Amino acid sequence: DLGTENLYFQSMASRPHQWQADEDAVRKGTCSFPVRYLGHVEVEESRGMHVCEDAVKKLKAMGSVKSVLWVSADGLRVVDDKTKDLLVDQTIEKVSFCAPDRNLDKAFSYICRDGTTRRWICHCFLALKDSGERLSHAVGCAFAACLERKQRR
Ligand SMILES: [Cl-]
Ligand SMILES: [Cl-]
């Protein structure tokens, strides 16, 4: 869809003195979060706070993998805890939108376009030690860092 959040505005709002460390970590490619990867789902939109919520409830009603979600300015990565296998390597430039969940506080998801499959694909998570919004803030820092480096280049 067409719809744009002011990234600067929401950066200034999200100021718990725990997330101060997250921003410098995302830029320095060291930022990680313990998660449970729910899976990917077809979604009818590139963005939507409720569109995500839906996609989460699809998977939560379907049937999860212990992993670590890594957040850098170049992309998001999910590494398996059991096998240490790289499960997901999603580039930050083809990520459309991300958001936490109004009704699942540990939930975090992001939408992305896959040009080969020609569809919008959500990717849901349940954080183990953190809140869903903490993760989303981290990925927003990526969105910012990306745009900022693309402007210099
Ligand atoms: Cl938005
Ligand atoms: Cl930088």
Swiss-Prot record:
It comes from the Eukaryota. Residues 27-153 form the PID domain. It is found in: Cytoplasm. Interacts (via PTB domain) with MAP3K7IP2 (via C-terminal). Interacts (via C-terminal) with TRAF6 (via TRAF domains). Associates with EPS15 and NOTCH1. The PTB domain is necessary for the inhibition of MAP3K7IP2-mediated activation of NF-kappa-B. Plays a role in the process of neurogenesis. Required throughout embryonic neurogenesis to maintain neural progenitor cells, also called radial glial cells (RGCs), by allowing their daughter cells to choose progenitor over neuronal cell fate. Not required for the proliferation of neural progenitor cells before the onset of embryonic neurogenesis. Also required postnatally in the subventricular zone (SVZ) neurogenesis by regulating SVZ neuroblasts survival and ependymal wall integrity. Negative regulator of NF-kappa-B signaling pathway. This is Numb-like protein.
